[PDB]
């Protein structure tokens, strides 16, 4: 089997991407944030504290003929941005882009933090990291990908995120029309539960390539590119008037600037992020200070190839016995 779903930016800045997902019988369609950096499929639901829901579509298990309470199971997760959610668990039929899993753990939120409530466009998350990070207790649950894997034509999914445009998540096949040149594959460590790999270096604009190992994760659920402070200073030094602002919480630059590209290595291959991808616009409405899309990882504990980086590539998440990542230009 295979599945193919379109993913759409939630706003003009590509702050996140939503993908429609069918849950239950009859289908309830919810728009989920596909997140290669976490392992829980959780939704706004009929169980979510009413004051914490503001415009999201909810999953109602009592209206699904295929919903079953997973008796005694609870979940609770905290993300890298300080957001959180928790609740109980149903099993139900989940379909993405025509690919169906029966008996998927659907984590029903009883509580969500303010950042989820305030984003009316995201009805929940669909985790695509390794199932060892799933938070369900006392019986850990499998991701949608892990449940679908055995049925797929090939044990892969691909992320093809758009710049200010829709893109695609594919399951079970590699669309050879969706990229240019060849896909370069690189080793993955699953030791931390993430799609963790080692970039071979970087360049700023038309500058020389610096060969250096940068360990990091491929994370569709993180907006920006978070790299070591050395690398991030070298980038922003090439932008007149750019600076790190403790008050704003990262590098800002004059909105009048033209940003240079940023290149990252995948083995002997190179992925170029155009300068326009690194512009996240005014820090506040009407400001002439703009927020940068490359930021320091120094306060995180890991480097994160988030959407700024991933949307410059066609990315293969190879879930074979020995997982690997693939990158192509497009």
Specify the CATH homologous superfamily of the largest domain. Acid Proteases
The tally of beta strands, per DSSP, is 24
Helix content: under 10%
Strand order across the biggest sheet?
18-17-12-13-22-14-21
Share of β-strand residues? 35-45%
Order of secondary-structure elements:
EEEEEEEHEHEEEEEEHEEEEEEEEHEE
Number of helices: 4
PDB class: hydrolase
Keywords: FragMAX, inhibition
Assembly: monomeric
Entry title: PanDDA analysis group deposition -- Endothiapepsin ground state model 55
Task: Give the topology, please.
Layout: E1 3-9, E2 17-23, E3 28-35, E4 41-43, E5 68-78, E6 84-96, E7 99-112, H1 114-118, E8 124-127, H2 144-148, E9 156-160, E10 167-171, E11 184-187, E12 196-204, E13 210-218, E14 225-227, H3 229-236, E15 243-245, E16 250-254, E17 262-266, E18 269-273, E19 279-282, E20 289-292, E21 294-296, E22 303-305, H4 307-310, E23 314-318, E24 324-328
Parallel strand pairs: 3-8, 4-7, 13-22, 14-21
Antiparallel strand pairs: 1-2, 1-10, 2-3, 2-6, 4-8, 5-6, 6-7, 9-10, 9-23, 11-24, 12-13, 12-17, 14-22, 15-16, 16-20, 17-18, 19-20, 23-24
Descriptive account of the structure:
The PDB classes it as hydrolase. Keywords: FragMAX, FragMAXapp, inhibition. It forms a monomeric assembly. PanDDA analysis group deposition -- Endothiapepsin ground state model 55. A 7-stranded mixed beta sheet has the order 18-17-12-13-22-14-21. The chain has a 6-stranded mixed β-barrel with strand order 2-3-8-4-7-6. The protein starts with a strand and ends with a strand. It has 2 domains: 5-174, Cathepsin D, subunit A, domain 1; 175-330, Cathepsin D, subunit A, domain 1 (Beta Barrel). The protein is globular. A hairpin with a 2-residue loop joins β17 (262-266) and β18 (269-273). The chain is built from 4 helices and 24 strands. The protein is mainly beta and 330 residues long. Helix content is 7%, strand content 44%.
């Amino acid at each position: 089997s295979t599945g193919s779903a379109t993913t759409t930016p939630i706003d003009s800045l590509d702050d996140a991407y939503i993908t429609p997902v069918q849950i239950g019988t009859p289908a309830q369609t919810l728009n989920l944030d596909f997140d290669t950096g976490s392992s829980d499929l959780w939704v706004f639901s009929s169980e979510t504290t009413a004051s914490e829901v503001d415009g999201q579509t909810i999953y109602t298990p009592s209206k699904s003929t295929t919903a079953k309470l997973l008796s005694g199971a609870t979940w609770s997760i905290s993300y890298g941005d300080g957001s959180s959610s928790s609740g109980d668990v149903y099993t139900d039929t989940v379909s993405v882009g025509g690919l169906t899993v029966t008996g998927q753990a659907v984590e029903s939120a009883k509580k969500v933090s303010s950042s989820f409530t305030e984003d009316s466009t995201i009805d929940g998350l669909l985790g695509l990291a390794f199932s060892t990070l799933n938070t369900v207790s006392p019986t850990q649950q499998k991701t949608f990908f892990d449940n679908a894997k055995a049925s797929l034509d090939s044990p892969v999914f691909t992320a093809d995120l758009g710049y200010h445009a829709p893109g695609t998540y594919n399951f079970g096949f590699i669309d050879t029309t969706a990229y240019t040149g060849s896909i370069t594959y690189t080793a993955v460590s699953t030791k931390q539960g993430f799609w963790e790999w080692t970039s071979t270096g970087y360049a700023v604009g038309s500058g020389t390539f610096k060969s250096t190992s940068i360990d990091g994760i491929a994370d569709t659920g993180t907006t920006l590119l978070y790299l070591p402070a050395t690398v991030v200073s070298a980038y922003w030094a090439q932008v007149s008037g750019a600076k790190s602002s403790s008050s704003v919480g990262g590098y800002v630059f004059p909105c009048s600037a033209t940003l240079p590209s940023f290149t990252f290595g995948v083995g002997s291959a190179r992925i170029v992020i155009p300068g326009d991808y690194i512009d996240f616009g005014p820090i506040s409405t009407g400001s002439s200070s703009c927020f940068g899309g490359i930021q320091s990882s120094a306060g995180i504990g890991i480097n994160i190839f988030g959407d700024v980086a991933l949307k410059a590539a066609f990315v293969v998440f190879n879930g074979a016995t020995t997982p690997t990542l693939g990158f192509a230009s497009k």
